[PDB]
Design a protein around this ligand. Structure first.
Ligand SMILES: *[C@@H]1O[C@H](CO)[C@@H](O)[C@H](O)[C@H]1NC(C)=O
Ligand SMILES: *[C@@H]1O[C@H](CO)[C@@H](O)[C@H](O)[C@H]1NC(C)=O
Ligand SMILES: *[C@@H]1O[C@H](CO)[C@@H](O)[C@H](O)[C@H]1NC(C)=O
Ligand SMILES: *[C@@H]1O[C@H](CO)[C@@H](O)[C@H](O)[C@H]1NC(C)=O
Ligand SMILES: *[C@@H]1O[C@H](CO)[C@@H](O)[C@H](O)[C@H]1NC(C)=O
Ligand SMILES: *[C@@H]1O[C@H](CO)[C@@H](O)[C@H](O)[C@H]1NC(C)=O
Ligand SMILES: *[C@@H]1O[C@H](CO)[C@@H](O)[C@H](O)[C@H]1NC(C)=O
Ligand SMILES: *[C@@H]1O[C@H](CO)[C@@H](O)[C@H](O)[C@H]1NC(C)=O
Ligand SMILES: *[C@@H]1O[C@H](CO)[C@@H](O)[C@H](O)[C@H]1NC(C)=O
Length: 1151
């Protein structure tokens, strides 16, 4: 029949064009929170077109029995469901919930089939996800184990609050309280939130945990355990569910410093061992294992697809010749490059408040630059005909630049400042021609948009789908439940699809938990948890896959003198001398830890440390002179290690040469004893682990320098744009009575008003600490944004910026968010892609150039590693033990069977489940049942253990896992015995809990049988030595930076990041903050109090003891400290990633 015409229309291209344009118009119509009534037209035309599509598709391969025809492709089910639902909801509404139209978002997924590239992109995505099977089960296993640990240790330790004092008052039958007023029913006093302490500055409730070191409930306040919870209730370790959630937050490192400062403040400073165990083993190892497995699967499928694809004339011509001769002179190219560079450095010289005529000089300079560029344009277009002069793909770009600049300058008599400059800004891209690194960067961007422009489109589709799902679900909830009595909505809601898109973007960045709480408290926990976990998982997976894709794609494509010399070298030969020196260096480094603010008042160890300093300098200068006398000058001064030692000895000498000789003690002389923090640097040349690691690091300096240059110029473009936009728009007013926020611009908008109403000393026009006012500060804001630490304030200050030097408005520039979206997606993401790519390339070719391949490992560690790799052999021989005599034969008849082990492995999972059921203040009746079932479990375990023992007499001690079972049985028996025996000792939440924790050995007894997890744990057992050397170096860096902070950053004003328990006032308080900052967490809050200066925000001339006239550090050294620490920590964790990936590839591919 006419089926021929239907199948003819099916294979058309106009068909796909119609499908695409209609789907896109729909997606434009689905993203509306409130569509006007005239959609019957719209939605009816849409459902008609979709039914027409499906009709054409079924008239081609149907009429009956469609099993080997249409409906055999799974993407047909989607269209079938869409056309079902589109007609379903037009006659029946019994299920009136209005949450069925949010199934319309499934037809926006049909785009993925009518493009033919996204289909195979998603095929690859699913093929990769199919490989994460083992990683997810290992992740949940370790997360649950650590969650049980945190459950035991911090059960109820998150509820402590500094409550007021009270007296029973003995005036009522029930417990009543007297506190100035009268309460009743003690729980009613405690649950009242008026008997709490708001933490300084913030609006939390001060936690205080009764212990020796953690927290300090103040004078008129008892530190008891009573209250709901912090963060509206979603934080405690009380139940296992909340514990699992908090430890997942820890694993994704999402706002984990807050959990850190809330747990250590109430449980114990010594508990940061738990946090440094989780941040290392869970977070940093599991994230890198995910990266490594996804990269391995991607590269494997890429290898597979590559393997498969394997199979008027006189003067005109005279001037033309002269010009073509002169213009192509490479010296003219050099001077044009210098002109471009000078122009970019001229645009940088713009800042917040330029003096008069400085802007005029800048305009004149850029006009001169325009003249130079148009002269080049004409004197090069004189060369040849546009037949060839308009080719090579570079001249067209230059011509577009010149015409844009010419047009924008001709448009001078108009209003344009923001994008006017951007028409001049893109000249920077010119110098990408003769640069072997900007070529690579633009090769990456082009591969992103041109070749691998399908996976980014998949990402955009997914972001749109999730944003509109979130809108449809959670739109109206925010509206009346959130805004204010004043009526202003939160900063992150889902009532626009722009804020919904922003929230999905922020979840992609990693900050998914604050919005999750804001949403859970209005729209129920179930849906709000499912959505925000699906977005997190899927979006981060696809982002990671895009990262690896682009990375790999752009990557793989008299005569007694000579006796005395040897005599004084004979002692340097003796190892005892070097051991003595190592010990003296350890002492001289440790002696720095005691330089804290309690040293002036100790008054006894002070002079001991003075004399120890003198003796250290003496024994070091003597040792250097002896190295000279025994090494001449050539070998010494060419070693480049003892050059560092000589450098240190220089300042150690100058120290005592200045003080006791010249009595100076003034100016930059004390700045030399703040530089003795470098004494631990002598440890680098002696501990072979750190020597090897620093060799590997300094090896990859050049490539790092080139990429630093290119990223610096790219961030320079972004920072000049930021200065053009935001220079002078961050200045807010603050009424200092109760003020950290603007003053409702309708009252005080301009700075003229802000300084024309100072009848009281209250109005302070205080700019944001980090802002865009010159290219110097722009780089700091760019670091904070691209690191996702402190960017909320930068955004909230730019988005609100309604003009130059005037008070902000709540959302007057709502769309300025798009600048930060563009920055985060280009600068941060692509910069980091290029960065990790060049680093892995350098490390890989450095290892390949060597012999013994692996780096970060000393020869002793290499031998230990070559011995360890033989433990997990391909096949350990079968024991097949002697069966037994009569008695033990009848015994072992049953135990050696292959179902007994599975039975035990399920009983032990039942034991895990009965461990999960714990809860704070569970029940007196229930603790009994739980202890009884626990002793029942240990009884069964002892029974199976003794049966297995009676099975084999000597052949029991060979499995190396059976021994582990026996050990856990013994420790469990001892724990059950000691359970109640104590009855006579001191407070034992620090003893009974740690004798109770030993029962998690049974939980760890699971992995005997899960090969997909035995291998993934061998991948860390076999990799521990390199992690250890890297950890030594990291601890050395922590030590040096903590001493620098203790010298400089003590006596700072206590505010946002620096409280009375995390500050640079002693060695422990400083090592805690530096461990927190190592993961780049909350360093924006640590740096904020340091950038203070004279009043307000501080007050100089304070009488603090050692360094007087303080109360607020200086920005210049603080920014340097924190930025260089961030870079160094980043490099070292990159090294960790490389080690993990290398070892995973060495263990997995070997089998
Ligand atoms: C009971 O109340 C009386 C009031 O006269 C008071 O003196 C006494 O200390 C109270 N005792 C207790 C145990 O509260
Ligand atoms: C407890 O309540 C009863 C009931 O009114 C009251 O008579 C009694 O006085 C109360 N107890 C005390 C100690 O006042
Ligand atoms: C409040 O009670 C605590 C409990 O030890 C005590 O240390 C503190 O001195 C009391 N405060 C006042 C003002 O009495
Ligand atoms: C704090 O310690 C005191 C003394 O042992 C005790 O009375 C109080 O209940 C404790 N509070 C908490 C929350 O541990
Ligand atoms: C500042 O705030 C205080 C109290 O909040 C108020 O009394 C005072 O008038 C305010 N002054 C200015 C200049 O905002
Ligand atoms: C500032 O005050 C005006 C009243 O004149 C009010 O309409 C506005 O909402 C206030 N600003 C904010 C941010 O609420
Ligand atoms: C600032 O705005 C106020 C009114 O909002 C106006 O009177 C004043 O002239 C403005 N000053 C400047 C410098 O813009
Ligand atoms: C406002 O006036 C007071 C009174 O002298 C002054 O201390 C304060 O610095 C002024 N604030 C600004 C931003 O000028
Ligand atoms: C909180 O601020 C008050 C202000 O008087 C101060 O006395 C106290 O020491 C501060 N405590 C902390 C922990 O910052």
């Amino acid at each position: 029949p006419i089926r021929r015409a239907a199948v003819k229309i099916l294979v058309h291209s106009l068909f796909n064009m119609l499908i695409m344009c209609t789907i896109l118009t729909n997606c434009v119509f689905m993203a509306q929170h409130d569509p006007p009534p005239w959609t019957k037209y719209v939605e009816y035309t849409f459902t008609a077109i979709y039914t027409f599509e499906s009709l054409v598709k079924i008239l081609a391969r149907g009429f009956c029995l469609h099993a080997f025809t249409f409906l055999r492709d799974p993407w047909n089910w989607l269209d079938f469901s869409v056309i079902i639902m589109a007609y379903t909801t037009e006659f029946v509404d019994l299920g009136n919930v209005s949450a069925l139209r949010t199934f319309r978002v499934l037809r926006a997924l049909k785009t993925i089939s009518v493009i033919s590239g996204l289909k195979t992109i998603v095929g690859a995505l699913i093929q990769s996800v199919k490989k994460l099977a083992d990683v997810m089960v290992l992740t949940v296993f370790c997360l649950s184990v650590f969650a049980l640990i945190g459950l035991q240790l911090f059960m109820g330790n998150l509820r402590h609050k500094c409550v007021r004092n009270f007296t029973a008052l003995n005036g009522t039958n029930g417990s009543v309280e007297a506190d100035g007023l009268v309460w009743e029913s003690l729980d009613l006093y405690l649950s009242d939130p008026e008997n709490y302490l708001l933490k300084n500055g913030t609006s939390d409730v001060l936690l205080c945990g009764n212990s020796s070191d953690a927290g300090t409930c103040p004078e008129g306040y008892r530190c008891l355990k009573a209250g709901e919870n912090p963060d509206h209730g979603y934080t405690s370790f009380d139940s296992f569910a909340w514990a699992f959630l908090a430890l997942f937050r820890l694993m994704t490192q999402d706002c984990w410093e807050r959990l850190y400062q809330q747990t250590l403040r109430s449980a114990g400073k010594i508990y940061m061992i738990f946090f440094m165990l989780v941040i290392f083993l869970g977070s940093f190892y599991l994230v890198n294992l995910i990266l490594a497995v996804v990269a391995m699967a991607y590269e494997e499928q890429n290898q597979a697809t590559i393997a498969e694809t394997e199979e008027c004339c006189p003067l005109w011509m005279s001037i033309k010749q002269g010009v073509k001769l002169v213009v192509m002179d490479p010296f003219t190219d050099l001077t044009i490059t210098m002109c471009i560079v000078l122009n970019t450095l001229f645009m940088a010289l713009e800042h917040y408040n330029m003096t008069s005529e400085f802007e005029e000089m800048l305009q004149v300079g850029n006009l001169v630059f325009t003249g130079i560029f148009t002269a080049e344009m004409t004197f090069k277009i004189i060369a040849l005909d546009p037949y060839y002069y308009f080719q090579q793909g570079w001249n067209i770009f230059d011509s577009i630049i010149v015409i844009l600049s010419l047009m924008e300058l001709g448009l001078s008599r108009m209003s344009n400042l923001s994008v006017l400059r951007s028409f001049r800004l893109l000249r920077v891209f010119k110098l990408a021609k003769s640069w072997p690194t900007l070529n690579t960067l633009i090769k990456i961007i082009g591969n992103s948009v041109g070749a691998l422009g399908n996976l980014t489109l998949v990402l955009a589709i997914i972001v749109f789908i999730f944003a509109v799902v979130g809108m449809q679900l959670f739109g109206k909830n925010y509206s009346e439940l959130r805004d204010s009595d004043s009526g202003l909505l939160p900063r992150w809601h889902m009532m626009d699809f722009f804020h919904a898109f922003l929230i999905i973007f922020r979840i992609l960045c990693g900050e998914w938990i604050e919005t999750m709480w804001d949403c859970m408290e209005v729209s129920g926990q179930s849906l709000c948890l499912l959505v925000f976990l699906l977005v997190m998982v899927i979006g981060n997976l696809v982002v990671l896959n895009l990262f690896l894709a682009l990375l790999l794609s752009s990557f793989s494509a008299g005569k007694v003198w000579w006796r005395l010399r040897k005599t004084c070298y004979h002692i340097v030969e003796h190892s005892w001398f070097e051991t003595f020196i190592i010990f003296m260096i350890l002492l001289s480094s440790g002696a720095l830890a005691f330089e804290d603010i309690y040293l002036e008042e100790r008054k006894t160890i002070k002079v001991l440390l003075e004399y120890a300093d003198k003796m250290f300098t003496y024994v070091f200068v003597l040792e250097m002179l002896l190295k000279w006398v025994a090494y001449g000058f050539k070998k010494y001064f060419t070693n480049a290690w003892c050059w560092l030692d000589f450098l240190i000895v220089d300042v150690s000498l100058v120290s005592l040469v200045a003080n006791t000789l010249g009595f100076a003690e003034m100016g930059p002389i004390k700045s030399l004893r703040t530089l003795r923090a470098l004494r631990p640097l002598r440890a680098l040349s002696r501990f072979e682990g750190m020597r090897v690691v620093v060799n590997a690091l300094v090896g990859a300096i050049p490539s790092i320098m080139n990429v630093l240059l290119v990223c610096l110029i790219f961030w320079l473009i972004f920072s000049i744009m930021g200065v053009n936009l935001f220079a002078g728009k961050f200045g807010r007013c603050i009424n200092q009575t109760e003020g950290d926020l603007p003053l409702n611009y309708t009252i005080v908008n301009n700075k003229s008003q802000c300084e024309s109403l100072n009848l009281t000393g209250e109005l302070y026009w205080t700019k944001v600490k980090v802002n865009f006012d010159n290219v110097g500060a722009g780089y700091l804001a760019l670091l904070q944004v691209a690191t996702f630490k402190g960017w909320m304030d930068i955004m909230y200050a730019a988005v609100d910026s309604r003009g130059y030097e005037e008070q902000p408005q709540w959302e007057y520039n709502l769309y300025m968010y798009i600048y930060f979206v563009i920055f985060i997606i280009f600068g941060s993401f692509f910069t980091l892609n290029l960065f990790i790519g060049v680093i892995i390339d350098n490390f890989n070719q450095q290892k390949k150039k060597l012999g013994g391949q692996d780096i970060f490992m000393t020869e002793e560690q290499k031998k230990y590693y070559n011995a360890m790799k033989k433990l997990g052999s391909k096949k350990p021989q079968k024991p097949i033990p002697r069966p037994l005599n009569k008695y033990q034969g009848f015994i072992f008849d049953i135990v050696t069977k292959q179902a007994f082990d599975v039975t035990i492995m399920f009983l032990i999972c039942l034991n895990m489940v009965t461990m999960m059921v714990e809860t704070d203040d569970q029940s007196p009746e229930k603790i009994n049942i739980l202890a009884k079932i626990n002793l029942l479990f240990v009884a069964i375990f002892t029974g199976e253990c003794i049966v297995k023992l009676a099975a084999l007499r000597h052949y029991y001690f060979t499995n190396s896992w059976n021994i582990f079972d026996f050990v856990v049985v013994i420790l469990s028996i001892v724990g059950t015995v000691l359970s109640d025996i104590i009855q006579k000792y001191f407070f034992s939440p620090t003893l009974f809990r740690v004798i109770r924790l030993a029962r998690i050995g049974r939980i760890l007894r699971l992995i005997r049988g899960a090969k997909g997890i035995r291998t993934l744990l061998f991948a860390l057992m076999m990799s521990l030595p390199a992690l250890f050397n890297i950890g030594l170096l990291l601890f050395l860096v922590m030590f040096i930076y903590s001493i620098f902070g203790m010298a400089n950053f003590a006596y700072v004003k206590w505010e946002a990041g620096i409280d009375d328990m995390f500050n640079f006032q002693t060695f422990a308080n400083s090592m805690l903050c530096l461990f927190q900052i190592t993961t780049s967490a909350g360093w924006d809050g640590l740096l904020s109090p340091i950038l203070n200066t004279g009043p307000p925000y501080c007050d100089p001339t304070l009488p603090n003891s050692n360094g007087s006239r303080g109360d607020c550090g200086s920005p210049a050294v603080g920014i340097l400290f924190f930025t260089t620490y961030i870079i160094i920590s980043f490099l070292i964790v990159v090294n960790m990633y490389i080690a993990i990936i290398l070892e995973n590839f060495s263990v997995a591919t070997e089998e």
